[PDB]
Ligand binder design. Structure first.
Ligand SMILES: O=C1[C@@H]2CCC[C@H]([C@@H](CO)CN1Cc1ccccn1)N2S(=O)(=O)c1cc(Cl)cc(Cl)c1
Ligand SMILES: O=C1[C@@H]2CCC[C@H]([C@@H](CO)CN1Cc1ccccn1)N2S(=O)(=O)c1cc(Cl)cc(Cl)c1
Ligand SMILES: [Zn+2]
Ligand SMILES: [Zn+2]
Ligand SMILES: [Zn+2]
Ligand SMILES: [Zn+2]
Lengths: 208, 208
């Protein structure tokens, strides 16, 4: 029973830690953990030498990073394989064009304005989704267009924008190499993920 | 008893956590913590609601930062008071000169070369110590001199260098305002700490 907040806090700390252990593969014994925490807090002689524990925890970290490196490689290869399957089927579909870099696109509506240069600025309404349809960014959520310097977005966009007349709307299919490649820092887009964009290029502006 | 490495690891995790709790004021009950970790790992219904725990842990963090903010303010004011006492006694000592910025210095040996400018580069052999004599940096450990642009060191050094002829050796006493002020990121130098330097200015070089 948890009468006091010392208990409520301790329990809450334990549950948060157990939750992080549970979904990380770390198989730990809560009773042996309580004993070592108690020995540390009481100032008693710990059951392991400073050195034994150091080896214990360093092996722990070594094994942990390896487990997390294998999972990342495993997902990186699954996405890569998924993306290739997708593009292989997509190249066959009507109106799809494949470029040397592997970028694919399909003209929805062809505009009549100018093609932007690698130093230009552009205004676009866009929507981006994973292969499974999961949308991860859209200007339609902002309710207004966005502006980018063509040379300052992912390679897939840079190669696409340079081919679109202003006023056009294209769907582009971006192999991970032209996108975020082996990403391991941002949640929305996993690693080696192929991306699908609807891009409406509104306006092009040069610079000085 | 800790027969297996599951136990050795768990115990070592517990001791490391208890050690970090012990010297942080966090009074926790290891048995109530083991219960909540076990409930999390087993998938059982936790004894507190998701919300109860959230309040528990957020109050915890609030109280923690405050305790750590009060300790820092307390040490910041102790160092500041120590440093002022030191400089008040030091201004009276033979050969000590006090400048408008509060910097104090004492000529050990006067050189005959040029005074460096605020854009110059200099070569110096130096030693820096806290008020209590604790040395925290020295070129005599490197065994060779160091180079700095006068405008790119702590203000105390910038105001001192501009007054020293090359070849001179001075002791300078730097109020924390001319040093690192309320530092809270680096261990060697605490906050609001007054610093004592022996500085030998070897050579001055201009720039283009
Ligand atoms: O080049 C891009 C691409 C292409 C269109 C513009 C957006 C912005 C975010 O609004 C991210 N960039 C710019 C960029 C991102 C990373 C490094 C360098 N440049 N993205 S994005 O793919 O829609 C995107 C949007 C968001 Cl919110 C997160 C991520 Cl990880 C990716
Ligand atoms: O202005 C300084 C002063 C003055 C002499 C040169 C050294 C260097 C480190 O070798 C640090 N600097 C430069 C500096 C430090 C911080 C921000 C901007 N400039 N220090 S120092 O005071 O000896 C010093 C040395 C070391 Cl190792 C750590 C600290 Cl926190 C401070
Ligand atoms: Zn957005
Ligand atoms: Zn190209
Ligand atoms: Zn050094
Ligand atoms: Zn000045």
């Amino acid at each position: 029973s948890l009468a006091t907040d010392k208990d409520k806090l301790s329990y809450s700390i334990g549950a948060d830690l157990g939750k992080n252990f549970k979904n990380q593969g770390i198989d730990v014994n809560p009773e042996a953990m309580a004993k070592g925490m108690q020995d540390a807090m009481s100032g008693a002689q710990l059951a392991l030498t400073e050195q034994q524990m150091k080896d214990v925890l360093n092996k722990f970290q070594k094994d942990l990073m390896a487990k997390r490196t294998a999972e990342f490689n495993k997902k990186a290869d699954e996405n890569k394989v998924k993306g290739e399957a997708f593009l292989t089927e997509n190249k066959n579909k009507p109106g799809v064009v494949v470029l040397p870099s592997g970028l694919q696109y399909k003209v929805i509506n062809s505009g009549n304005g100018v093609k932007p240069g690698k130093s230009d600025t552009v205004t676009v309404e866009y929507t981006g989704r994973l292969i499974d349809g999961t949308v991860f960014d859209s200007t339609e959520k902002t309710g207004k267009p966005a502006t980018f310097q063509v040379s300052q977005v992912i390679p897939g966009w840079t190669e696409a924008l340079q081919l679109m007349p202003a006023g056009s709307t294209w769907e582009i299919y971006v192999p991970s190499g032209l996108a975020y490649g082996p990403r391991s820092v941002g949640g929305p887009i996993g690693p080696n993920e192929t991306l699908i964009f609807k891009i409406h290029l509104i306006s092009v502006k040069k610079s000085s």
